[PDB]
């Protein structure tokens, strides 16, 4: 599939094997610039190559399976300049402190519409989310292995201190065809927040809670391009 | 031609008409932000989309032809959190002054190679200098205006603060082809540096006045797709 981002992502079409709920997730660290620094925090995360290439050479912290439900979080820190210590939500499957002053994150797998047609996805970010979405852009269909560095442009992204730290997608969606996602986020200091929801034409309600959305899928010989 | 930056990139083929001496500048204010800010620079440089669409909105200062000669420069500041004025080079053809501790530049036209072989360009800059090369790449051949925003990967970037604020590309190119070239400048406070030379396997000269090598090429009905 082609990397560029679209209003018609194509999506996959897995085989017998169950999805296993959730997203996979790394975390690595993110340091701060030695004492006395002006300012204090490292602006290595919004060098171009730090989503692909420069976040593997920070310290890896985790990689969990299993994210899925609300995975909105507000970190409140009390200092400027400091690693402060907190904890993702359960929805995380990470069950240790981190940094959550500087920190940062790799979310990807796959997801499954209810209904066929229009989304709207609204992303914010404190302070850095970047969402690729659709096969290629994100990843290819059970060959995630190999193409995982190979993302496109972005979809949608978020960052904080921009004319506003807020951005949407809309993109017309198949039900029950599993959709490549791939979403990165940094917090370079003090607070961190991500939000990530979605409203679809089909009613007013907005989803925050995606139990029944992300899914994990496992690479296979042949891979699962989309049938429909 | 594919937009993705390469080690043979494709160059152009212009007819009769002759080609203006140097590169097309076009400068650009940034901004610091509110006073009491922290830090007081502006992170918009380093927005991904600040290259291509994002600087569009901050005030024209001037657009210039001409730009030739030894386009290097080292602006030393004296205060910082502070617009101080300076002047560019006389290459780039600009006889005011301006804030030289905070402001965009973009230089386009096309590098016309004395020798055919491999050419390594060795770029640094303060604080960013961002380099497209080849056409599609860059932009189209003598269809700049309809492909000026459409540029590729980079070729080469430098970000001062990063490990090294160094980069190269090496290239194969051949002797009288036009490559389009396009480098994009910013300062974000305190001292400016654009570093851009290069070195051929034919000697070892290093060439660092583009006299004889940058020039302008008309947009045309038909374009002017390279044909050797
Ligand atoms: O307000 C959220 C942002 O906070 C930023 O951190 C600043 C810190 O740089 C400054 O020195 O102190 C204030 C608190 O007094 C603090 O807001 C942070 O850089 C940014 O990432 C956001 O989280
Ligand atoms: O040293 C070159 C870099 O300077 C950076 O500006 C810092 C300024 O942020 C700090 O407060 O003061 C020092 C001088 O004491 C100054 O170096 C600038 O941000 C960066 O763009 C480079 O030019
Ligand atoms: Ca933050
Ligand atoms: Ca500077």
């Given at each position: 599939?082609?990397?560029?981002?679209?209003?018609?992502?194509?999506?996959?079409?897995?085989d017998?094997?169950?999805?296993?709920?959730?997203?996979?997730?790394?975390?690595?660290?993110?340091?701060?610039?030695?004492?006395?620094?002006?300012?204090?925090?490292?602006?290595?995360?919004?060098?171009?190559?730090?989503?692909?290439?420069?976040?593997?050479?920070?310290?890896?912290?985790?990689?969990?399976?299993?994210?899925?439900?609300?995975?909105?979080?507000?970190?409140?820190?009390?200092?400027?300049?400091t690693?402060?210590?907190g904890?993702?939500?359960?929805?995380?499957?990470?069950?240790?402190?981190?940094?959550?002053?500087?920190?940062?994150?790799?979310?990807?797998?796959?997801?499954?519409?209810?209904?066929?047609?229009?989304?709207?996805?609204?992303?914010?970010?404190?302070?850095?989310?970047?969402?690729?979405?659709?096969?290629?852009?994100?990843?290819?269909?059970?060959?995630?292995?190999?193409?995982?560095?190979?993302?496109?442009?972005?979809?949608?992204?978020?960052?904080?201190?921009?004319?506003?730290?807020?951005?949407?997608?809309?993109?017309?969606?198949?039900?029950?065809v599993?959709?490549?996602?791939?979403?990165?986020?940094?917090?370079?200091?003090?607070?961190?927040?991500?939000?990530?929801?979605?409203?679809?034409?089909?009613?007013?309600?907005?989803?925050?809670?995606?139990?029944?959305?992300?899914?994990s899928?496992?690479?296979?010989?042949?891979?699962?391009?989309?049938?429909?």
């Amino acid at each position: 599939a082609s990397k560029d981002p679209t209003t018609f992502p194509l999506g996959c079409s897995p085989d017998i094997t169950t999805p296993k709920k959730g997203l996979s997730m790394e975390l690595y660290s993110y340091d701060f610039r030695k004492k006395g620094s002006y300012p204090c925090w490292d602006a290595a995360y919004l060098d171009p190559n730090y989503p692909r290439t420069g976040y593997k050479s920070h310290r890896l912290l985790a990689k969990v399976d299993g994210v899925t439900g609300n995975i909105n979080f507000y970190y409140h820190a009390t200092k400027g300049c400091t690693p402060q210590l907190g904890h993702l939500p359960a929805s995380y499957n990470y069950p240790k402190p981190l940094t959550m002053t500087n920190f940062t994150m790799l979310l990807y797998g796959y997801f499954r519409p209810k209904v066929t047609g229009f989304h709207t996805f609204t992303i914010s970010a404190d302070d850095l989310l970047f969402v690729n979405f659709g096969a290629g852009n994100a990843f290819d269909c059970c060959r995630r292995d190999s193409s995982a560095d190979h993302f496109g442009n972005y979809q949608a992204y978020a960052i904080w201190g921009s004319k506003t730290a807020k951005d949407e997608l809309t993109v017309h969606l198949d039900a029950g065809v599993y959709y490549p996602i791939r979403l990165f986020y940094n917090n370079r200091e003090y607070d961190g927040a991500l939000s990530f929801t979605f409203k679809t034409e089909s009613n007013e309600n907005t989803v925050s809670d995606f139990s029944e959305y992300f899914f994990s899928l496992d690479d296979t010989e042949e891979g699962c391009p989309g049938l429909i």
